[PDB]
UniProtKB/Swiss-Prot annotation:
Coverage span on the entire protein: 313 to 386 of 664
Annotated consequence of substituting residue 72 to K: Impaired lamin assembly
Family: Belongs to the intermediate filament family.
Site (Heptad change of phase) residue list: 18
N6-acetyllysine found at: 4, 29
PTM statement from Swiss-Prot or TrEMBL: Proteolytic cleavage of the C-terminal of 18 residues of prelamin-A/C results in the production of lamin-A/C. The prelamin-A/C maturation pathway includes farnesylation of CAAX motif by protein farnesyltransferase (FNTA and FNTB), removal of the last three amino acids (-AAX) by RCE1/FACE2 and/or ZMPSTE24, methylation of the C-terminal cysteine by ICMT and endoproteolytic removal of the last 15 C-terminal amino acids by ZMPSTE24. Proteolytic cleavage requires prior farnesylation and methylation, and absence of these blocks cleavage. Farnesylation of prelamin-A/C facilitates nuclear envelope targeting.
Transmembrane segments: none
Name of the protein in question: Prelamin-A/C
Site (Stutter): 13
Length: 74
């Protein structure tokens, strides 16, 4: 115990210097991950918007083409 009491205290030192910095890093990843899951929904709406817009321009294109089926026929 002449140097065996300054070996159990430096073993509880890096079990608090590691365990904590792991949790501060885990929380960084998990903060960034929720920010990632966030950008994933902004996009799955921004797209779903543009899609239901594209379905309207395809409906107009058929009506402009049906208007053409008569106004361009012999």
């Amino acid at each position: 115990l002449a140097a065996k009491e300054a070996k159990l205290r430096d073993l509880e030192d890096s079990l608090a210097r590691e365990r904590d910095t792991s949790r501060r890093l885990l929380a960084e990843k998990e903060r960034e991950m929720a920010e990632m899951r966030a950008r994933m929904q902004q996009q799955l709406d921004e797209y779903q918007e543009l899609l239901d817009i594209k379905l309207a321009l395809d409906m107009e294109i058929h009506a402009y083409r049906k208007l053409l089926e008569g106004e361009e026929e012999r």
